[PDB]
Ligand binder design. Sequence first.
Ligand code: CLA
Ligand code: CLA
Ligand SMILES: C=Cc1c(C)c2cc3nc(c4c5[nH]c(cc6nc(cc1[nH]2)C(C)=C6CC)c(C)c5C(=O)[C@@H]4C(=O)OC)[C@@H](CCC(=O)OC/C=C(\C)CCC[C@H](C)CCC[C@H](C)CCCC(C)C)[C@@H]3C
Ligand SMILES: CCCCCCCCCCCCCCCC(=O)OC[C@H](COP(=O)(O)OC[C@@H](O)CO)OC(=O)CCCCCCCCCCCCCCC
Ligand SMILES: CCCCCCCCCCCCCCCC(=O)OC[C@H](COP(=O)(O)OC[C@@H](O)CO)OC(=O)CCCCCCCCCCCCCCC
Ligand SMILES: CC1=C(/C=C/C(C)=C/C=C/C(C)=C/C=C/C=C(C)/C=C/C=C(C)/C=C/C2=C(C)CCCC2(C)C)C(C)(C)CCC1
Ligand SMILES: CCCCCCCCCCCCO[C@@H]1O[C@H](CO)[C@@H](O[C@H]2O[C@H](CO)[C@@H](O)[C@H](O)[C@H]2O)[C@H](O)[C@H]1O
Ligand SMILES: CCCCCCCCCCCCO[C@@H]1O[C@H](CO)[C@@H](O[C@H]2O[C@H](CO)[C@@H](O)[C@H](O)[C@H]2O)[C@H](O)[C@H]1O
Ligand SMILES: CCCCCCCCCCCCO[C@@H]1O[C@H](CO)[C@@H](O[C@H]2O[C@H](CO)[C@@H](O)[C@H](O)[C@H]2O)[C@H](O)[C@H]1O
Ligand SMILES: [Ca+2]
Ligand SMILES: [Cl-]
Ligand SMILES: [Cl-]
Ligand SMILES: [Fe+2]
Ligand SMILES: [Mg+2]
Lengths: 34, 34, 34, 334, 37, 37, 30, 30, 341, 30, 39, 38, 81, 38, 65
Amino acid sequence: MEVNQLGLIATALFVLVPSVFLIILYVQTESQQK
Amino acid sequence: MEVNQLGLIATALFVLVPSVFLIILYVQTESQQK
Amino acid sequence: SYPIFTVRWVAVHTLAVPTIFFLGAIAAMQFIQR
Amino acid sequence: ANLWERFCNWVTSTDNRLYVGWFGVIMIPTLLAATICFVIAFIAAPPVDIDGIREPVSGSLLYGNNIITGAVVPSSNAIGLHFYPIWEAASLDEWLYNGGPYQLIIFHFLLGASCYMGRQWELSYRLGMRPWICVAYSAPLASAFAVFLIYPIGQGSFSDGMPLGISGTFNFMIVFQAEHNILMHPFHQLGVAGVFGGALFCAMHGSLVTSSLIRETTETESANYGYKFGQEEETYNIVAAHGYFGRLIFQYASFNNSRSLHFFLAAWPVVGVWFAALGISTMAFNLNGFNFNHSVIDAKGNVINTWADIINRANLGMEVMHERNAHNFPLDLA
Amino acid sequence: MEPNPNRQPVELNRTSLYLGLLLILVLALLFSSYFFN
Amino acid sequence: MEPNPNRQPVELNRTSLYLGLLLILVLALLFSSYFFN
Amino acid sequence: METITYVFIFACIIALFFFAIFFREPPRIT
Amino acid sequence: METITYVFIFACIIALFFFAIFFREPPRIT
Amino acid sequence: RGWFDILDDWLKRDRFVFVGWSGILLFPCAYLALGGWLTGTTFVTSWYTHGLASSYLEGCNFLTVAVSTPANSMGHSLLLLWGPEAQGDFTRWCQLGGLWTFIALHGAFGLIGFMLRQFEIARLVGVRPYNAIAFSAPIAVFVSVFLIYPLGQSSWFFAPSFGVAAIFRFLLFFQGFHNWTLNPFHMMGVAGVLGGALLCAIHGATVENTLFQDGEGASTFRAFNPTQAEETYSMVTANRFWSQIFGIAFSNKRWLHFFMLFVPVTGLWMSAIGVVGLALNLRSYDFISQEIRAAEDPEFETFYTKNLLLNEGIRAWMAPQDQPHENFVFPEEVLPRGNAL
Amino acid sequence: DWRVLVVLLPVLLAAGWAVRNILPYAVKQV
Amino acid sequence: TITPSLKGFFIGLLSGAVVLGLTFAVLIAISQIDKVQRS
Amino acid sequence: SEGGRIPLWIVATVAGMGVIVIVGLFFYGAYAGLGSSL
Amino acid sequence: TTGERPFSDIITSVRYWVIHSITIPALFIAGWLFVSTGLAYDVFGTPRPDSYYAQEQRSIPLVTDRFEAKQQVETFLEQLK
Amino acid sequence: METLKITVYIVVTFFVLLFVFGFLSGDPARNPKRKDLE
Amino acid sequence: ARRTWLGDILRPLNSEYGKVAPGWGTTPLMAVFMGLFLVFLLIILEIYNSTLILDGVNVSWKALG
Ligand code: CLA
Ligand code: CLA
Ligand SMILES: C=Cc1c(C)c2cc3nc(c4c5[nH]c(cc6nc(cc1[nH]2)C(C)=C6CC)c(C)c5C(=O)[C@@H]4C(=O)OC)[C@@H](CCC(=O)OC/C=C(\C)CCC[C@H](C)CCC[C@H](C)CCCC(C)C)[C@@H]3C
Ligand SMILES: CCCCCCCCCCCCCCCC(=O)OC[C@H](COP(=O)(O)OC[C@@H](O)CO)OC(=O)CCCCCCCCCCCCCCC
Ligand SMILES: CCCCCCCCCCCCCCCC(=O)OC[C@H](COP(=O)(O)OC[C@@H](O)CO)OC(=O)CCCCCCCCCCCCCCC
Ligand SMILES: CC1=C(/C=C/C(C)=C/C=C/C(C)=C/C=C/C=C(C)/C=C/C=C(C)/C=C/C2=C(C)CCCC2(C)C)C(C)(C)CCC1
Ligand SMILES: CCCCCCCCCCCCO[C@@H]1O[C@H](CO)[C@@H](O[C@H]2O[C@H](CO)[C@@H](O)[C@H](O)[C@H]2O)[C@H](O)[C@H]1O
Ligand SMILES: CCCCCCCCCCCCO[C@@H]1O[C@H](CO)[C@@H](O[C@H]2O[C@H](CO)[C@@H](O)[C@H](O)[C@H]2O)[C@H](O)[C@H]1O
Ligand SMILES: CCCCCCCCCCCCO[C@@H]1O[C@H](CO)[C@@H](O[C@H]2O[C@H](CO)[C@@H](O)[C@H](O)[C@H]2O)[C@H](O)[C@H]1O
Ligand SMILES: [Ca+2]
Ligand SMILES: [Cl-]
Ligand SMILES: [Cl-]
Ligand SMILES: [Fe+2]
Ligand SMILES: [Mg+2]
């Protein structure tokens, strides 16, 4: 099919950038003392 | 120019995945009890 | 007080004997004419 | 203190995050100008008529290049060694067509890097250090001079100076081999001994010191934490490292003196690279590599090829193809 | 340099991570068709 | 469940972060031309 | 590649279901 | 897109220079 | 304390030249590789394999002598002296290029021998075996270039020949046919070697210029004692200097020296990977977008297209003499040439 | 082949000579 | 059937066995003679 | 015989001169006979 | 040290030079004659200056067959009459 | 272009003067140890 | 540590940690086999390499039709 060529990178970054934000926050929370 | 269409997502993930790996490790290191 | 025929002696001569023979050869070669 | 005294005190202050100094006073603006012009040109400069035959070569990213092919392209053969600053052009468009950015960049850079060397002397002096790090730096610097200034002087044109780009660098190397047989030149060979040797001794030293690190850590932590910045004790056992290396070859091939050893580490690549620079700088006046073309001849007189003659065939391919529209007469005399 | 007294540690508990990832992944599942068009 | 005694904390100091980012970014700057071809 | 993308995102979502159920932070009574 | 990518990676590297230098972990004598 | 252990005792005696178990592999193979190279470059032709003179005996000099690879028609024959080609005849064996495989194989096993030596002595002296580990890069280079590369190609003929000028030819061949300079693995190699050289230089010079005055001499080498406990130069001063000159500086010595191991070793390993690709003509030869544009647009020119023109020259002008088994006859009229030249 | 004897006469004369000169110390060592 | 190259293989095999054998014979002998002294 | 009888400096000088002689011979060979291009 | 006699001792001893003022020239002369008698050519199969080509031949005697290579070279040599 | 040239000439002269006068301003004395170097 | 049915079954197969046979034991025998293995590899290599050429063994695509 003739899809938009930026659809792939757009979707990949849409997923990855906020997911990675969250993962960073979570892991640095787990690593705090107590 | 007739570049390879996967080049963009290839470069993007090549940079972002390991960079994000390092940022995660660094941030959870900082947050560990000093 | 010192030995003469040692591992070192052998090593040394395995290199030095052929080196002098060879140098004799190459010397001779300097006087070969077509 | 008066304003100028205060200013001098600041310039030469040992407490600036980056040392300025009087060499720095020249270095900072020239390197900034060379850098800015270089980045803008590499991204956006139009095609440049490098060989003065109205055959413009595209170097910038926006005009069809990638990182590997792109370059700031040397100034026109028509200009030769003439000084071509922006104010000599009728317009910025002319300036760009003729490769003005190249001259601006390499002059500002050569000045700026020379001052970088001086600045290394200067700070060594302010800090109570011995002065010769700058002498080590003179080797890469001399090389830069060789390919950006001296070779163009000798050949009569900045159009034959090294291009500011990756593929352009390879272009320079191949044409150099065609025209000078640099591979067969003993100064280039000393250069190769210099950098192969430098690499070798880099790995060797690194591995010996790393191999004799004194145990200060557990297996779950990096051994690096066993060294603390500014500790007075040496962090490795040089007697153990010497015992090892001395047994690897034989004892008197190994350094027991650390100062002697580190002096070696500095001298080998620096001297080798000095000869590389001098090799470029003297092939700049066409004293070329060894020519053993047709040197072996049989009893009748038939040519008996050696590997040198095969080299010569490759060089011929380079020669006959390079700058394919620029020569009108049979000898390429510069 | 005096440390800044206004600093504060940041947290994201596991449940918030799961919720957030669900949000992102489901949003992506929704908008991706429109990104490809 | 009883806690695993083999767990260890992981670290990446700031200098390692900077070196790592430099390696990644420069490798990308080098290889990207080839990925675009 | 569009199909690969749709199926990928979906698969990640199912994986997340698995972790969110079996590797939740356990509720604890105070 | 290519050009944008090349220049973007370069820009990230320059920014990285800035942080590595002015926001390095300070060396401390023991 | 039986015969094995007595032998072990003797092998590990602390003598001028240490032997070791590894010495049994190393010394004969290293000796035969060196001796073979010297024998060949002194006395042996390459007439029947390459149509070349290659010895002092024939009039070649240090730069032009070589032990040359065998004829392409030999393929990847081990070319053993007792093999089906030479059939025990030493002279013919020399004429067929037997010394090439002799030197490459004994050399390979000698390198194994030497690295085993590094492990053995490190174990004996009580140090970590990072020297052997570092030596893995030489191994990778030798094996990729002298063994894997020709094994991917038609025959041993296209391996490097063992000679100065011969190696120069190998380089130029790789430019012309493989566009090897364009290869990112070679580029990483270059960065590792030039960066290794840089680290060698800068570390040596830095140490020598942050020395403590530990003596009264103006020549300062004698003011060191291998047994001394103190650092002989100032890491703190070194660190401030480079911090203010370059922006960043080492602060950790252990890291410094590990890094010095890491850069050139990694460089050489990458270059090896590239040559493994060139074994199959799996080259970084072209940029496809470049070629599409240039084919359609006769005014589009970059340094990349310039260099391919150079490559095309190299191939056409060197192939007939460099590849005599192919019997190339390229008439004058087909040779690529620019104007006048 | 007379050439091998004319060529390897110096080598064996050398070996014989040094054997003659080092014989007592060699016997003492062995 | 034993071809010329199978014969050559036996010659190579044999020659290698002889080289290794003589080598270890001499090494073991010399080790037996010149023993390390321990107390 | 006893070691040290012949001055190490004389040995070094003589050896060195011999090396210069033989190398000098090889460079002479570069211009005469085989390899001379003539 | 590792038990061997210092090289400084050896090479500055009279006996060393009594031995080697014979053995070194002997070897040198041996190699010399290995070339001058022409034995080197025959041992290693290297062409003399008059044995690269037959008189009117201008084609390299390149080996083109793996298993009959030996015979090829022999034929090539006979071709020099 | 003439304004550009004049400008650059003034700039370059300014910085060069800073260099020269700067190194003329008691530079040997600007070190940690022996300051009396006149 | 936790016992299981299957764990209980397999327990003997992982109970002899560190147990050795005295001295050199069967090392000589092992050596022989290693020797044989070496020669074996040497053969197949040389067959593949056409250094060793045997009747009825045509190392080619044209081996069997
Ligand atoms: C340990 C040191 C060492 C090693 C690893 C090698 C390795 C090699 N040599 Mg070198 N060589 C050496 C020392 C060594 N050599 C010495 C000291 C000499 C001087 C004599 C030589 C002189 C020499 C020549 C002239 C040649 C070689 C060649 C070779 C290659 C082929 C050898 C082969 O196929 O053997 C096969 C044999 C073995 C692997 C022996 C294994 C024996 C097994 C383990 C025991 C069983 C034996 C059995 C009982 C015997 C039965 C015989 C019966 C069937 C008749 C190989 C790379 C050849 C070459 O390089 O060609 C290009 C070649 O022509 N070598
Ligand atoms: C009669 C019974 C029988 C038969 C008909 C076969 C038949 C075969 N065996 Mg098998 N084998 C048998 C019994 C048998 N075997 C038994 C009882 C054992 C003991 C368990 C084996 C163990 C064995 C091994 C280990 C191998 C075979 C292999 C083979 C195949 C050889 C042809 C080939 O492609 O080699 C190609 C392989 C070689 C010619 C060997 C190369 C050896 C290298 C060069 C040694 C050095 C490697 C080192 C990494 C150096 C790298 C350097 C390089 C990078 C330059 C062939 C199918 C070979 C195979 O699997 O091929 C696909 C193989 O490797 N066999
Ligand atoms: C051409 C470049 C080059 C050469 C000549 C070279 C040479 C050497 N490196 C050695 C070591 C090292 N090199 C190392 C890292 C590096 N080495 C590098 C590049 C080189 N290294 C680079 C770039 C690095 C960075 C990774 C390390 C870490 C070491 C060591 O630890 C070791 C050492 O001790 O150095 C002080 C020594 C190994 C001695 C030995 O194996 O004896 C045995 C001799 C044998 C086994 C014979 C090998 C025969 C060879 C393979 C084929 C025959 C070659 C002919 C005889 C000569 C042909 C010459 C023509 C091509 C012109 C030797 C001096
Ligand atoms: C005297 C000969 C000088 C030769 C050229 C210069 C060589 C040394 C320069 C290297 C600079 C390294 C960067 C700073 C490194 C650094 O800081 O050096 C420091 C080191 C030690 O300094 P010292 O203060 O202890 O001694 C120097 C003076 O103060 C006098 O004592 O300097 C030296 O060893 C001087 C060596 C003189 C003798 C050197 C000869 C070596 C080369 C011989 C020729 C080889 C040519 C081969 C061609 C095939
Ligand atoms: C007047 C100013 C002149 C210089 C200005 C610009 C200089 C920029 C210097 C590099 C800054 C980046 C450092 C990041 C990484 C960083 O912050 O490292 C800091 C690091 C500090 O080391 P330490 O010994 O303190 O580390 C000890 C422990 O942290 C180890 O875990 O230094 C090194 O490791 C030196 C070796 C790497 C040196 C790499 C230099 C690369 C040069 C640039 C090459 C790429 C250019 C691409 C062009 C597109
Ligand atoms: C191969 C073979 C073998 C072996 C043989 C051998 C082992 C040999 C050896 C040989 C040898 C071992 C030789 C040697 C030679 C040497 C020489 C030839 C030298 C020369 C030198 C020179 C020339 C010098 C130079 C220089 C330098 C280097 C630097 C300083 C300066 C000068 C310039 C002086 C056998 C029989 C087993 C088997 C068959 C095959
Ligand atoms: C799309 C590409 C993304 C790539 C993503 C890669 C994921 C990487 C996951 C890293 C896992 C981090 O692992 C994390 O380590 C830290 C310590 O280092 C642990 O932290 C533990 O040690 C510290 C320090 O003693 C204690 O203060 C803390 O209370 C304790 O729980 C965390 O319990 C663990 O969660
Ligand atoms: C420490 C280094 C010591 C180095 C010592 C060097 C000694 C050199 C002595 C030079 C004596 C020259 O002696 C020289 O001998 C050779 C024979 O071998 C003769 O050479 C003759 O034989 C060759 C072939 O072998 C012919 O190609 C040549 O045309 C013919 O003249 C020369 O006619 C003669 O001039
Ligand atoms: C085109 C190039 C220009 C060529 C000019 C040639 C001029 C020749 C005469 C130069 C006169 C030098 O004059 C120089 O400058 C000022 C004048 O207040 C002085 O001023 C300096 O004094 C001390 C010296 O320790 C410094 O610490 C202080 O920072 C500064 O005030 C210098 O000590 C003086 O020596
Ligand atoms: Ca004649
Ligand atoms: Cl060109
Ligand atoms: Cl012209
Ligand atoms: Fe060091
Ligand atoms: Mg000559």
